[PDB]
Structure 1
Amino acid sequence: LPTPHEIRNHLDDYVIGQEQAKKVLAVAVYNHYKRLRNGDTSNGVELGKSNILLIGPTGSGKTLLAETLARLLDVPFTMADATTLTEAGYVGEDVENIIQKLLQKSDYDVQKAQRGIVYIDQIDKISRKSDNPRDVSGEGVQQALLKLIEGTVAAVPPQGGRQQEFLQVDTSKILFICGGAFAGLDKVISHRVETGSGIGFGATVKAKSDKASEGELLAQVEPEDLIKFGLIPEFIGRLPVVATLNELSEEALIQILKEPKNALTKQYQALFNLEGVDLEFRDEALDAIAKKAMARKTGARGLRSIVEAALLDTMYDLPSMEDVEKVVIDESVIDGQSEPLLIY
């Protein structure tokens, strides 16, 4: 049933700018389900576990891929958070609660829940930082999660009980997608491999050029680098598949403002349409916006700042203004040097 060719096209409809990452997920997703079709029946013994490790910058679409995949996929999907997770459940939460929410989506169907997908956001949150210690969000969380990720049956009261019984739902079959923004990881990889600082005439020095630090550096990531970050090596050993996402290109940004149905121009113009005046954006403004956005280095999430701040003056006085049929925005408006000219 799974198709790697079609799934890549489907993700392209909702995600843009990450072509390599789509290929990685299609292989792991196809392999994981194929394994369950014939479980441990092949001649090959000790088959490697198929897991996913999403790693990319902010606004790269980590949370977006989990949403799009859930809609396209038939099995139930869940969206949890690592910040809420706590060890030995004092007042925050428990690891077993993740399984309870999965059944609510699957309507207490063990046969249908074991084939489900799991996605945990902000994986970096559980990084073990116990230099000055007890720790409720550090080693305790990762230790409990590793036990679950290893594959074990955990007691879960079905429906809560009206019984003193619990179901032994398997865990090795269920898939897991550990993803989150890694801050400081680039420095760790750069610290290990620099291959520079040559003072000789023959030697070369690169101060601004960083050999595509946003994308190339991620491609050369190793498990040993994450160990210094704080993660446990056994946790990384269980995830042979890692996804690397490069920084969005200026071309990709333009596509994100036009092709998607959640585009800023579409919603903002729709909002202006309610007022009664149409909104027009030229192509020259779009490429200009992309350059400013990349400078901020905030991702797509910070794109809105440039568009809104530029239109702050226009929206403030637009209701008072009358007899304006359409609004025209030029490239200079993005810079802010020239005010936009209205159409009557």
Structure 2
Amino acid sequence: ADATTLTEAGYVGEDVENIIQKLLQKCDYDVQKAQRGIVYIDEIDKISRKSDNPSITRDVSGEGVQQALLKLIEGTVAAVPPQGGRKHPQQEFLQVDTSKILFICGGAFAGLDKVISHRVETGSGIGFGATVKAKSDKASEGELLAQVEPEDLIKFGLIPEFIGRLPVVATLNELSEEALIQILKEPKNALTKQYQALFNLEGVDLEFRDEALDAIAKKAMARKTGARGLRSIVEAALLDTMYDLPSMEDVEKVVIDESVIDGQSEPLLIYG
């Protein structure tokens, strides 16, 4: 589900109950199956309040969505149409209890690290009177997130009642050259493996080199584009290669070098 689409009841935006409707589609409108289903929510940070503590106006996209999810996560009957209200008499709206339905929320938080750093940061006061030096050391984003507590999330714009429904909290860390390098070949549906299959079907073999992966990883982390940036670099290096590959023939293997990624070389072609 998408949290941004959700809005308070009585508005044009998508209703919260529609999430349960999607689950029914997977089990062929089976109420019993949905009662024991699993639900995942993404970008939950978007609905957080943005300095809305005074509550000048109600936020249907922000605080409003959290309030609606309070009882839903805990468990309650949800009135969802079986077939979009086929007939008005004897509608029999499906009552799907969510007391046993698991919920998983996920989202990238920007600025939360600073909030945690401020709390962890020492220093009672400034001047000679201060008895503590307030010494601090630089920490990684993942390290700070591990020390997260519910109090920090509240300051981010989350209702205390909402966070209370999520007892277990899990954090993630960034990626490094070794991680990106492994992701390029170790996973089944890896980026490099996808291109190999695309070339194998045309009777062409493809090979990579460790030096090439190192440059790829460095370029990805240099642009700050995450794992998705890898695809941009790979396609950009093989653009000219595949632009004319179907034209010629008699090519059996292709080899990529580090200089090719740098743009001062070209891929090596092997003729059978």
TM-score norm. by structure 2 comes to: 0.83
Change (3 A) 1:334 1:203: farther
Q: How far apart, CA to CA, are the structure 2 residues paired with 1:200 and 1:255?
A: 50
| CA positional deviation for 1:202 | 18
Matched, 1:318 2:254: no
Q: How far apart, CA to CA, are the structure 2 residues paired with 1:153 and 1:222?
A: 31
Change (3 A) 1:275 1:147: same
Change (3 A) 1:199 1:329: farther
Q: How far apart, CA to CA, are the structure 2 residues paired with 1:206 and 1:295?
A: 35
Counting helix residues as a fraction of each chain, which structure ranks higher?
1
| CA positional deviation for 1:234 | 0.9
Tell me the equivalent position of 2:27: 106
Q: Secondary structure at the match of 2:115?
A: helix
Q: Deviations over 1:265-319 (max 9, x none)?
A: 1221222234443221112222332232233333222221221222233333444
Aligned residue pair count: 265
Change (3 A) 1:282 1:322: same
Q: How far apart, CA to CA, are the structure 2 residues paired with 1:119 and 1:183?
A: 21
Change (3 A) 1:207 1:310: farther
Change (3 A) 1:267 1:148: same
Q: Deviations over 1:68-117 (max 9, x none)?
A: xxxxxxxxxxxx11111111242221111111121222233333221111
Report which stretch shifted further, 312-321 or 89-98.
312-321
Change (3 A) 1:265 1:209: farther
Change (3 A) 1:314 1:191: farther
Q: Secondary structure at the match of 1:244?
A: coil
Q: How far apart, CA to CA, are the structure 1 residues paired with 2:226 and 2:36?
A: 33
| CA positional deviation for 1:209 | 11
| 8 Å Cα contact 2:122-2:136 kept in structure 1 | no
Change (3 A) 1:281 1:209: farther
More contact order relative to length (CA 8 Å, sep ≥ 6): 1
Q: How far apart, CA to CA, are the structure 2 residues paired with 1:197 and 1:167?
A: 57
Larger Cα-atom Rg: 2
Unaligned runs of 5+ in 2: none
RMSD of aligned C-alpha atoms?
3.9
| 8 Å Cα contact 2:52-2:157 kept in structure 1 | no
Q: How far apart, CA to CA, are the structure 1 residues paired with 2:135 and 2:234?
A: 29
Q: How far apart, CA to CA, are the structure 2 residues paired with 1:291 and 1:119?
A: 33
Q: Deviations over 1:175-223 (max 9, x none)?
A: 1101111122222222333459999999999999964413211111111
Unaligned runs of 5+ in 1: 1-79
What percent identity do the matched residue pairs reach?
Answer: 99
Q: Secondary structure at the match of 2:201?
A: helix
Q: 2:43 aligns with which of 110, 122, 131?
A: 122
Change (3 A) 1:105 1:143: same
Q: How far apart, CA to CA, are the structure 2 residues paired with 1:228 and 1:83?
A: 20
Q: How far apart, CA to CA, are the structure 2 residues paired with 1:204 and 1:284?
A: 53
Change (3 A) 1:250 1:208: farther
| 8 Å Cα contact 1:128-1:231 kept in structure 2 | yes
Following superposition of structure 1 onto structure 2, how do residues 1-344 of structure 1 map, counting pairs within 5 Å?
80-129=1-50, 131=52, 135-162=59-86, 163-195=90-122, 211-344=138-271
Change (3 A) 1:108 1:295: same
Q: Secondary structure at the match of 2:64?
A: helix
Change (3 A) 1:200 1:333: farther
Change (3 A) 1:200 1:327: farther
Q: How far apart, CA to CA, are the structure 2 residues paired with 1:180 and 1:323?
A: 49
Q: How far apart, CA to CA, are the structure 2 residues paired with 1:288 and 1:208?
A: 37
| CA positional deviation for 1:147 | 2.5
| 8 Å Cα contact 1:130-1:138 kept in structure 2 | no
Report which stretch shifted further, 320-329 or 169-178.
320-329
